[PDB]
Amino acid sequence: SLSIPTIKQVRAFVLRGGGADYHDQGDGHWIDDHISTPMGKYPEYRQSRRSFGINVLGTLVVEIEASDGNVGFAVTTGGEPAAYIVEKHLARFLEGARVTDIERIWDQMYNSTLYYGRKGLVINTISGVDLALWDLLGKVRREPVHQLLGGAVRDELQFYATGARPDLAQKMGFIGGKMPLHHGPSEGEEGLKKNLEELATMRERVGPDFWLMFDCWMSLDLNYATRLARGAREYGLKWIEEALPPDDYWGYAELRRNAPTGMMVTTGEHEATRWGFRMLLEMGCCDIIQPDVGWCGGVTELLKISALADAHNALVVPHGSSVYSYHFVATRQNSPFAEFLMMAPKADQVVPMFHPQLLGEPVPENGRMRLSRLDQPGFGVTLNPECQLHRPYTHE
Amino acid sequence: SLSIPTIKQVRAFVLRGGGADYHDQGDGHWIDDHISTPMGKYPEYRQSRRSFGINVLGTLVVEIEASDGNVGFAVTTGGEPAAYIVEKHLARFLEGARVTDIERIWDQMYNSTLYYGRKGLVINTISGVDLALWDLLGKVRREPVHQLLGGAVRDELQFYATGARPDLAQKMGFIGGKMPLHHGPSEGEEGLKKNLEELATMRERVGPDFWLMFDCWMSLDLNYATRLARGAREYGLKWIEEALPPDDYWGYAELRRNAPTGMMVTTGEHEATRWGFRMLLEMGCCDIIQPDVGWCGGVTELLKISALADAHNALVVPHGSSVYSYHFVATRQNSPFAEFLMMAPKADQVVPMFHPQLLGEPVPENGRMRLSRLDQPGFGVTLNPECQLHRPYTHE
Amino acid sequence: SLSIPTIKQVRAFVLRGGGADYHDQGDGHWIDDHISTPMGKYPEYRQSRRSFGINVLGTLVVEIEASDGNVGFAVTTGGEPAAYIVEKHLARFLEGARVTDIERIWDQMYNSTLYYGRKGLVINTISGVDLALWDLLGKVRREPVHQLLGGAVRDELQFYATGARPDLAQKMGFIGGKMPLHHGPSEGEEGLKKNLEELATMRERVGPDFWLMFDCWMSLDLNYATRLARGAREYGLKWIEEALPPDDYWGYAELRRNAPTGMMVTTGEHEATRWGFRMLLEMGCCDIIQPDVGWCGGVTELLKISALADAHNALVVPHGSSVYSYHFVATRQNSPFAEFLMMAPKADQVVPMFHPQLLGEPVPENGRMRLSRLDQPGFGVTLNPECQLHRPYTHE
Amino acid sequence: SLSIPTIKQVRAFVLRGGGADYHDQGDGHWIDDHISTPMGKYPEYRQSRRSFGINVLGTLVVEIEASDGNVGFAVTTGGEPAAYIVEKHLARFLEGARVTDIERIWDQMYNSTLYYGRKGLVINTISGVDLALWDLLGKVRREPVHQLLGGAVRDELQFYATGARPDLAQKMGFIGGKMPLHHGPSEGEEGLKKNLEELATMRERVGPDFWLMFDCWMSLDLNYATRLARGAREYGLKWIEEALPPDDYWGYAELRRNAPTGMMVTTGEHEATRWGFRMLLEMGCCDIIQPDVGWCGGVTELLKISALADAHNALVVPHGSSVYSYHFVATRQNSPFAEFLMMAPKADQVVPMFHPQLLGEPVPENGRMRLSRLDQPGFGVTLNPECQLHRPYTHE
Numbered sequence A, B, C, D: 001s002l003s004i005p006t007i008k009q010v011r012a013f014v015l016r017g018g019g020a021d022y023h024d025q026g027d028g029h030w031i032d033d034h035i036s037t038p039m040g041k042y043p044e045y046r047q048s049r050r051s052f053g054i055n056v057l058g059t060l061v062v063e064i065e066a067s068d069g070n071v072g073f074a075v076t077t078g079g080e081p082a083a084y085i086v087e088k089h090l091a092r093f094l095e096g097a098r099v100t101d102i103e104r105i106w107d108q109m110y111n112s113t114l115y116y117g118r119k120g121l122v123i124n125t126i127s128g129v130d131l132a133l134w135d136l137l138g139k140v141r142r143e144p145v146h147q148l149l150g151g152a153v154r155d156e157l158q159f160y161a162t163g164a165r166p167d168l169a170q171k172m173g174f175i176g177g178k179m180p181l182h183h184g185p186s187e188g189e190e191g192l193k194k195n196l197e198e199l200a201t202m203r204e205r206v207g208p209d210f211w212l213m214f215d216c217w218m219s220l221d222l223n224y225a226t227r228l229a230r231g232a233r234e235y236g237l238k239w240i241e242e243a244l245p246p247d248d249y250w251g252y253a254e255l256r257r258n259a260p261t262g263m264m265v266t267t268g269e270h271e272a273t274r275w276g277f278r279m280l281l282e283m284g285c286c287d288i289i290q291p292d293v294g295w296c297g298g299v300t301e302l303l304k305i306s307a308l309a310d311a312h313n314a315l316v317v318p319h320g321s322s323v324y325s326y327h328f329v330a331t332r333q334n335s336p337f338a339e340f341l342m343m344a345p346k347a348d349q350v351v352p353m354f355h356p357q358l359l360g361e362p363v364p365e366n367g368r369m370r371l372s373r374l375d376q377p378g379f380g381v382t383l384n385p386e387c388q389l390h391r392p393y394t395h396e
């Protein structure tokens, strides 16, 4: 017998520069420094990911106003094409609904966009609406999102750090260091040696116990990944992440079989929905699944993905997605540690992931975050008023 | 921002005489009239389920008092042995916890009782405590439980009725009638003819379109179930329910292959946890899963079970458990209709399912329940003060 | 030693009203008349597909100008969000390339968009660029596209007709009639009877031999599709098409097993790339695969999809996509007949499919098309100058 | 719009002495120096492949004259028996056809010869005719064949060299050296040691990084191949090629499982058609497929084979067939390097592969071939007028 507000209006905005699009940069950043990609077989696209257009979309901001004056928002990747989808297509299912109608809303967004959806941009868009809906609901109930997700199961988050400097991540208190791979199969035996040299160097600097992992960003083939993982076992690599293109379900299962015993094969960043993850889990593709909350369907969908993994006794370590991941992973038994992305250009200082777009964003202190930092309603952040919002589309 | 109360005490009561134990009944009920069981191979044990001791436990009542004065409660089947387990084992994980610590508490309960749990009585007990925690959280929040489970996805529930008179159920506006099987394999060819005559009689009464189903209460073998299912094709039987003992996963998968095409094989009321239902789904055992919320692991666990069935594109139609089902199934895309047990002795009028235990319990009117009937906090019921609770155990 | 031109400029335009978006209508059309969809479980979205936003995108026109003054174009579904992708992302891979660089271009478009692509809108966009590239190449060589695809293997195309009136399609010379399904699972036994009545009526009108098929537009579940196909065998239904959501690979394989012997199960309209079709073929999902040229990756990708099917000895009967399908299917041994979509509102006269957008569009005469009608360079059509082109984005 | 010439005549010639028959050689060649074969279990047949009759056929030359005066040609292995087949069987499908009728003609050739084809000599003949049709179409169009096959995907080919001197191949700038096996299972433990000493010697000469490969010409059994592969691990053998007879699909799949992890198993030079290569890929027989364009079904069929390997994410590295490979592999994303046979007797200098048959034949310079070297129409070669063609058959 609480008075549940209805949704008055949904708006989509475009923002540009850093934030929820991680690869929307323009400087001397590690995240654009010769990262191996599927495009790296072309020499002219090898140095920079921005050169093939990793930064083309920008940030989608979804804002949902309720009848009580509460506003939820989320940031994700999608920019102007995603804003068109929110305003012209998706908003019709939201406006006039109760803020508790979350299951209904997701299903309607998914079913209505199926003919041009399933994976990719359209699912990113759905996810951003979903996140904004969970933020709004938390704001309405005056509760952090983790309290709406069955409550935290640990009083502290522990992080590994993703970036070019695991050695410095160690000095900053993190439990591990995930490095990007810099050389793909088209650089032959020399690029392989270089990959292994980088790992050797970092291992020498950190000692035998600190976790090291490679992120390969879809860039290898089965034989190269097999040979890299075999080479890597000398330096105690914990896992090889996203070795293959996301459509290569058969390849991942082969790789996992051919991996050194005790080394993990992980994927799932570019996978969407319960049915994408069912395929990974059932085919044996995967030791850990690593969906992006903002790209896999949102919190609502990730909840079902996570329970799928629960039945499979698999780990779920989501893509670092600032508060959108922290509130989720706090509540999951199958998520014992979390990813933090190093968004400083030299990966040499801890910096908020969604700067400058977000305010109230907590960050790991000495590689940890107390649950008591996640005490504010919704996802506990506000949109920075200094950020320049464009609304390219309207509806009625 | 909202201040979250802690759990002050947990109490375990025993009630006897109807309610949550469906089979805790007096004389002259359909539910004890010659129902086919695994025990019917003994003629001494064939007429009455009470004679082999279907009614030995009765009702466990779990009460949880929060620090703000709020009290959540749930009823399930388990009685005095379950009450030992709540008071002496389980209450240690609850007392002093925040009322939102739901995922944690479940995990602690399951993992601490593993050495003597996994299935059966201990899971019933965990489910009861879990249901009481959801009741409490709903009461704290001043929201019905469906609003905590992602919102309703439909305006209205629609019911089939379970009992010996689907012809009367049709007049009362139900969509379907499920009838208990009365003869098992040991009664031979005459039993088979009697089973099918019973179905023929009801089909003649109801017309061609009305759904008819058989519930076999684990009582068959593969070949009898196959032949029963084949004979029932002529009268358009919609599904065969719980044909086989719940450990016979291999059998269920064979029966579903052997089934007349278009006819469903259903099970799972005597199955528990995500891993039990993973076996069922992955082995292709059934078209519909039918867990009892009060026997399978509670709302917390059913949530994961339901997500697993989402991924498998299977239906979940929970074994009717009054308000504990109703609030759940309202929210699930994969539960499009619901079970209503006909708890009247002659099955000739709608009676509240968990009568006389629960005050304020909604019933189907004309086979339907508007979602506005479930607008009261928690599961929307109060314990009948005219019921006399025994407390067999305390704890420090 | 021909002088091969390079690509000067790519442009993306938006058009609205009919054409390459088939469901972009606004009248009394059969194609929006109570078609069963995944959204049909909601009564308010049941009557009209436009009500959930099937028409939200519009038509993408991709125009590619070469250095010799030749211009290729294609029309597909995608509208303004697709136009953004063409102009801002994709055009960089095309401008400065030789017009023969088709394999290189496709791979670069696919690999660069993988992080937000794989299926759906992004693949539609790629397909439209690809089609425009093949049109351009044909214009340059002064040859129809079928001559660039290994040449036609038949001198005539034979069509079935998709629409609400197979009886009239028969009088117009077509070999078959594919009808849309009007009632889904949520309309229960009554909607089933109605579906079967429609098929009964049409069968009575056409005689025993004329092909009848159902298109279900992703709208059923396994049991409903199983029961519909079993019901349908009395009236000699040739195939059931797109019964299930496109992610339900496991469901399709089950359905195909449970189909009446000799009845075909088909899908693939909402499937993309070689790897999507590999999954369908290998899992046994499918008797015929039915990709849309404008949605599966374009001609370049469909060529590999088709050769996959060749190895599988499976039929490929693409979605009717006017000239974009006719030039392709002419050359394929595994494509012995073709789809024609009935774009007249009452499906009562043969009408060009991409009217008003295209000029020079051939249409079946008496259910057939001579290969001699496909004698003009490229896909042999021109953009109607009366159509109102908007260019919402530019680049440099 | 461009007027398409018809096929006027087809002629079949026989040449002897090098060229397209690799094994049609005189004395003192490495390619006949004690090469391990299935016949080496007979000591009488161990020293020389010519002694069991590797050289019995020689070169089939197929010439096709179009009505505009253009003449296409191809060389493959088959000689006088193949020439019977071209003239008496196959020419009926070609004469009077448009030169673009390539898919049709292939299909007619395959389907008319099925009763005595499927594999082997008849497929060689079909491949020769097919290659000549592509030559003709290129000459008609005034385009090289790579521009008809979707365009080059790379600026440059890179080669490994096949012959008894990979040490000399390294100095000549090749990326790799593949060496023939000289001892098979019947030569026992000493043969095995000799095989590995040979590899050790080359590894010492070339350094650690240069690719080394063994080509076993069908000569092993499973256990010998497993033990050979295991011994070769120490010297970093990149792949084992054609270890087993081509009918032993089950064997290849076992060997690849038994292989040292990271080492590739390759086959397919003596395999033909899409269905042969489907068996190979689906059974997990090999990491690289290696068809000969002149033995597998021609360019038309290789195109489908290549697409099947695309879907399987496998590499296609065709068995070097001079310009017929080079034009093909230029276009394929899945052929990143290419084979060059060292046709010099002592393998000490680059000699044109199909010398003395083909005038204008390009060679690798420094292990590489710029795409600008293949700028001449068709396959860019002319028949050497100093070669003396026999015409054993005519036809009406």
Ligand code: NA
Pocket (backbone or CB within 6 Å): B215, B241, B242, B269, B319
């Ligand atoms: Na039951």
Ligand code: NA
Pocket (backbone or CB within 6 Å): D215, D241, D242, D269, D319
């Ligand atoms: Na070879």
